Design a protein around this nucleic acid. Structure first.
Lengths: 130, 162, 256, 192, 76
RNA sequence: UGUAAGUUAGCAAGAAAGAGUAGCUCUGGUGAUUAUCGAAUCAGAACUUUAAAGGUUAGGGG
RNA sequence: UAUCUGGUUGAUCCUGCCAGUAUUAUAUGCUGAUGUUAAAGAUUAAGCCAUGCAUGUGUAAGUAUAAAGACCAAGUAGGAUGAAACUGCGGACGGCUCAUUAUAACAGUAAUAGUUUCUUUGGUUACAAGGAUAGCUUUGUGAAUGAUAAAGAUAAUACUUGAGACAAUUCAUUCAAGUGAGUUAGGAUGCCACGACAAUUGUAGACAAGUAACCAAUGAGAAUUUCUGAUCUAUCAAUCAGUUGGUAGUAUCGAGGACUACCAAGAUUAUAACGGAUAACGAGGAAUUGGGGUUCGACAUCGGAGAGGGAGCUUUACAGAUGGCUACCACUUCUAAGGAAGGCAGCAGGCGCGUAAAUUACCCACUUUCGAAUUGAAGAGGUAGUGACGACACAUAUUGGAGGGCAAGUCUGGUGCCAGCAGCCGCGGUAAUUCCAGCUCCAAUAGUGUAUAUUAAAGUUGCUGUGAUUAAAACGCUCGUAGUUGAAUUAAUUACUUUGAAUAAAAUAAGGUGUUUAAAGCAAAACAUUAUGUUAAUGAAUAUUCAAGCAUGGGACAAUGC
RNA sequence: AAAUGGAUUUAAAUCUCCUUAUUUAGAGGAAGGAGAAGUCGUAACAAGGUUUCCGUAGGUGAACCUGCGGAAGGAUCAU
């Protein structure tokens, strides 16, 4: 349709050819409100409930140090990095922390298998300057 | 919007943060005119880019267009009085040939250094900032003061400031 | 919006008042009367801004409530009285008489007058209808209702009013050889001579008017206000004489 | 109360109309008053802008105009014989516009006697034309030119003439009507 | 309908982004006086605007021109 | 008025579930013969009361 | 600045995505010399509220023997002034919020020959009568509300009657001139209802002042209505029965199924009706853009709607009012246990909620609104306080990093596939360029990192502008309706195009002007040693501007012609 | 002209059915993904040791095997 009066097909095509866009669709339909532990919010807050440790993928060896959090707004149970170094000894347990996320990757970034969240506060003045 | 006043920007950061080609050119102008940081060069580039855009818009029109004649002459008149464009070049195409050096050489810090009032371009900044320099009738402590052609020979030291 | 609005925000005020956008949050809403909201100048605006006789609304009250300001021949004590078109304005304590008139820049300009020409006014007829009892009357742009008029006084004409008596002195027909000052759209304050009057059956009449410098333009019949007959005015025009310098002459004269 | 807005209706496409506001006074309706026949009873209704509407709850008398003779005479209303909208209005004697009613032609007959010297209620009315202060003979010859419709005469002799209410009793508080004539009387008489 | 017809207007809507027009239509309910007896479906009709005469009828037929037939003469 | 799962698509189904119904005084629709004559049937409206299928006959449902 | 770079391989050329990059705006970590300007409990909870304030008003003018008038002051109808009270006016404006809302509202446009107040402005039409009511006095109740009961007086521009002499309403008939167009403004006849220009006030500031109806303006106002214009969705394809039209009526300020009676079977839909979603109030506008676009707009200004949830009403010119009332639901408070009021989505402030948002301040001096009025009020408005949301100018120090993307160390100590770094590829298994530290220097600099989201990059949504043999992707094939596209040809509309009309500002662009420059503001002067003058000084022409609507010149390319 | 009786109009509130939407518990059943260099085979890539693949039908611990009909993306552009 390349005509001076065909503006209905050229508009009803880039309206039904635009749902096969993976990042546009995923940010239009309703999963960001049911299938997102965070929601719209960049940061959340929850109570640490279990100190954990997650193994690494397999070009790598070691044990990551992370937590388990029940958030206030939703009530879901998540997992989250305890950033850089020797910080699992700053969180204690049942403390209210601040979660931020990681950024992106394929989809999961920091603690290798299935962790997408990073602690930024311990109800203190952040797990950097503590 | 929430406020009834107006607030505008004056500079824009470069697209590519790290280039060695750009870092040396910035340092050449920083040392040559004794500027505080790279914001002052960015302000000059933004100011020049505004005028370049205006001249480029009129240059696409007809030569005798009423819109071009009104806006073209207005841009040239302001540029001549600012001293950026020498009076011999009376055509819009000379605005496009301007560079950041033409504008930087019209700051008060540069002029009072060229007039010999200060030993170095850095001494001029300290002299200006100390309320020590008067332009005609009116003391100035901002080195970014762009002096016009008529106000150029009215720059002199202060007379016993309090 | 349960009823009539009594306030008027500053940014909503008509543009030709030029109320500074940061002076305040409100503008003086002109009380109803002879002239509409957007074709009138409140008495407070005239004194405080155009004449600098007062520096705030408090002082305008002192001047107007002192029984010192006369609109037309009568004397008004309303701070927000709508002063519109050629309606004269006299301050006898200062011995000056003005006339609210349009200029080429789409604005109300105070044209000074002598005491002799401050004794009359030009009114534009708006309609002519037979009242009850077969008594005809005319309604002018001012809003005056005038009893039995001359039978020739039609709808779109102009009359000369004697302010001391209220009698009809002189009338000008709305013909194709008479001067006119536009009061409406883009042509506010422009003065020319009617040269063509093309009428469309359904919607509007558009009039072709030739300026005194040969320039031509068109306007709706609503905006035409006949000033005089045969290029001769019955009132004194403002400084520009209703002639527009197109775009450059105003610029260069302002640079100079 | 009753509302006259169109926000409670459906679109011309059949789709339901949703709600954005509540009821408002601009679209206020009032309970109808069915003006019956009986002792005089009117009420004053404060309408919008303070104006007053005269709500006639019950009426008995009314002013009726005879178009041909150019007179208007007050008269008592007897019965309502035909309502073109609802047959219920006939039984209940509801006075509304366009309601064919019956009134006693006493003042009209009395006016005709004084103005003309003859009586419509006479069964020998047309005979009394042929057979004759004394200048009433000049007027006597108007009828040998102009004639009345028969159904009007029967109403005069029977004491019940047909008239059509031409006012709004629930708005003006009065019954203003006119006596039916040639083409209208035949149409409305065949309905009855 | 009795003393009422439905008038269809075909026009073009300009979509700025694609710089092309699209065909649209709207139906207007208008009042047809019995002065126009030979008015049927498919005829060209000029209408003018009057006061609201019904819930939807707000126009009135002023003139009409007969057009080609389609074996179904549905007169007013 | 309203009516589900299931289904061999025929049914389920009188599904389930809700409302009305009396007396009196009236109004209107359904024809024949060419104004007169005639049929039980349906719909509607005021008023009244002890508020109406229930004397007898007369499915409990999921 | 019309820009790309790292990653599939032993190496190569592609498709393609992931990551990087810059910018906006929200939170947050570290840090912080100044001046100007400035957002600030919207996001989650239109959830709940202690307390304080946010609506009142007096001139010579409606009424004042206050036992008020040592306070100017004297006083025989009440001397200036006058608290409370009756009467009049106002609280229907302003202020807050965005829950509802998908042709609904809103924007442009057009009509009202289909309605119309209030205020203000022009006009038009008996030498003086009758009762009773508050403040006042007196007797009181109740725990108590902005609670209230009896009796005794006393005024009116309060409530009435009444001469002073027409006006507008309904109905019937009739003669008819502006307007594009009217049995039209208007006149005449007959009839009913209504019926006046205070039975009014200043002795001082004859002249004011006040009043009742009826015309016109305010009024391009308000309210209805015309044409065009909205996001996603077909795992929403048929929807509707006052529904579509007619006649008569009813109701209303008025058209109108707005409602009623009778009659007919109509109205919308593939050009997307009817449904569903919105973390949807609409617009001016905002962020980012080479051009085209994409995303946002609770919140300056305009329009709409609401006051915990519905519903019903009172007063009045304007309210379906909630800083008005009544009833039901859910709450909150006082209580003498008998009973009572209240609605912070007003300004401060508190609880809860969340990542996320400030003083229980001062004043009417600016702008302006209300009022019996030059004076009184105003949490409107102004000033101050907190304020690294942001923007501008300006001193001399922090933040992040040093393998590549990406500017910067193959420096030294520990650590030994452990601790750990790492947005991506990856580095670490004892000689780490990447961990943890010390020194050095790289970038920006009073700012700089992180996280989420918008925009560019993305010619990875394509109109400009993509790809379909093998990377993902031509229906198995043909017929076929809507839709789209259609050979050459001729010496009334629409569409297109050129000029305009008319159209709110703020904002964008742009013209002038030395806010010290700058962001700003729309002002200040350049001198006239300046009142004097230029000068009746500036107001950028301030242009926009798309989709519709109106007028104009042209008829090449197109459609309906007929 | 106040309490008060009655009949309409507008109707809150509440109860009973039925529908829609969202969230959520469940013995058991059939799936997908990731990890742990787990047990059984060798299906595919070379003619992968029976050329591979597509549709369909049946069978079998598992890849898969076999029948009918296609394809070369074949290991033949050739008598």
């Amino acid at each position: 349709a390349r005509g001076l009066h065909a503006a209905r097909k050229m508009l009803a095509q880039r309206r039904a050819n635009k749902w096969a866009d993976k990042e546009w669709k995923k940010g239009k339909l309703v999963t960001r409100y049911k299938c997102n532990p965070l929601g719209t919010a960049s940061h959340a807050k929850g109570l640490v409930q279990e100190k954990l440790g997650i193994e690494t993928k397999q070009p790598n060896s070691g044990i990551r140090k992370c937590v388990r959090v029940r958030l206030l707004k939703n009530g879901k149970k998540i997992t989250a990095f305890v950033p850089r170094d020797g910080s699992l000894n700053y969180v204690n347990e049942n403390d209210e922390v601040l979660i931020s996320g990681f950024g992106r990757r394929g989809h999961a970034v920091g603690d290798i298998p299935g962790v997408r969240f990073k602690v930024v506060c311990v109800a203190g003045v952040s797990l950097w300057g503590l | 919007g929430r406020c009834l006043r107006n607030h505008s920007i004056t500079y824009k950061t470069p697209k590519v943060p790290y280039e060695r080609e750009r870092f040396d050119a910035e340092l050449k102008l920083v040392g040559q005119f004794g500027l505080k940081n790279k914001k002052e060069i960015q302000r000059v580039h933004y100011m020049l880019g505004h005028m370049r855009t205006i001249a480029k818009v009129m240059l696409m029109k007809d030569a005798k267009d009423p819109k071009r004649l009104l806006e073209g002459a207005a841009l040239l008149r302001r540029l001549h009085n600012l001293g950026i464009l020498p009076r011999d070049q009376n055509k819009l195409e000379f605005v496009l040939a301007l560079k950041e050096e033409n504008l930087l050489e019209r700051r008060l810090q540069t002029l009072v250094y060229r007039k010999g009032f200060a030993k170095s371009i850095h001494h001029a900044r300290v002299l200006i900032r100390g309320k020590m320099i008067k332009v005609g009738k009116q003391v100035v402590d901002v080195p970014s003061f762009l002096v016009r052609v008529e106000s150029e020979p009215l720059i002199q030291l202060a007379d016993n400031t309090p | 919006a349960r009823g009539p609005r009594h306030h008027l925000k500053r940014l909503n005020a008509p543009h030709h008042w030029m109320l500074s956008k940061l002076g305040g949050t409100f503008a003086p809403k002109p009380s109803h009367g002879p002239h509409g909201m957007k074709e009138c100048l409140p008495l407070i605006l005239i004194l405080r801004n155009r004449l600098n006789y007062a520096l705030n609304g408090r002082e305008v009250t002192m001047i107007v409530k002192n029984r010192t300001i006369k609109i037309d021949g009568k004397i008004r004590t309303d701070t927000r009285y709508p002063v519109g078109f050629m309606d004269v304005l006299s301050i006898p304590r200062t011995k000056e008489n003005f006339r609210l008139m349009y200029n080429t820049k789409r604005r109300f300009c105070l044209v000074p007058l002598t005491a002799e020409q401050a004794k009359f006014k030009l009114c534009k007829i708006e309609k002519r209808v037979l009242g009850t009892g077969a008594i005809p009357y005319i309604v002018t742009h001012d809003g005056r209702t005038i009893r039995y008029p001359h039978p020739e006084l039609q709808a779109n004409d102009t009359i000369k009013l004697n302010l001391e008596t209220g009698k009809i002195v002189d009338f000008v027909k709305f013909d194709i050889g008479n001067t006119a000052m536009m009061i409406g759209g883009n042509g506010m304050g422009r003065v020319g001579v009617i040269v063509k009057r093309e009428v469309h059956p359904g919607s509007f009449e558009i009039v072709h008017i030739k300026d005194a410098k040969g320039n031509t333009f068109t306007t709706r019949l609503n905006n035409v206000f006949v000033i005089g007959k045969g290029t001769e005015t019955l009132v004194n025009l403002p400084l520009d004489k209703g002639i527009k310098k197109p775009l450059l002459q105003q610029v260069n004269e302002t640079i100079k | 109360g009753i509302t006259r807005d169109s926000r409670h209706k459906r679109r011309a496409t059949g789709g339901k109309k949703n709600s954005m506001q509540k009821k408002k006074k601009n679209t206020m309706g009032r309970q109808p008053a069915n003006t019956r026949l009986g002792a005089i009873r009117v009420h004053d209704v404060r309408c919008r802008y303070g104006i007053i509407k005269r709500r006639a709850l019950r009426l008995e008398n009314g002013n009726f105009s005879w178009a041909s003779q150019s007179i208007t005479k007050g008269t008592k209303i007897l019965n309502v014989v035909y309502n073109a909208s609802d047959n219920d209005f006939v039984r209940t004697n509801t006075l509304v516009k366009g309601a064919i009613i019956e009134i006693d032609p006493a003042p009209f007959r009395l006016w005709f006697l004084k103005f003309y010297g003859k009586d419509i209620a006479s069964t020998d009315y047309y005979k009394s034309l042929e057979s004759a202060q004394k200048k009433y003979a000049k007027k006597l010859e108007v009828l040998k030119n102009m004639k009345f419709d028969e159904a009007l005469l029967e109403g005069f002799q029977s004491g019940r003439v047909l008239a059509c209410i031409s006012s709004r009793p629930g708005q003006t508080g009065s019954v203003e009507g006119y006596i039916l004539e040639g083409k209208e009387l035949d149409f409305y008489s065949k309905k009855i | 309908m009795k003393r009422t017809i439905i008038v269809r207007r075909d026009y073009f809507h300009y979509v700025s982004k694609y710089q092309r027009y699209e065909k649209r239509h709207k139906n207007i309910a208008v009042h047809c006086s019995p002065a126009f007896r030979q008015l049927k479906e498919g005829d060209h009709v000029v209408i003018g605007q009057c006061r609201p005469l019904s819930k939807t009828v707000r126009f009135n037929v002023l003139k009409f021109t007969s057009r080609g037939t389609g074996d179904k003469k549905q007169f007013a």
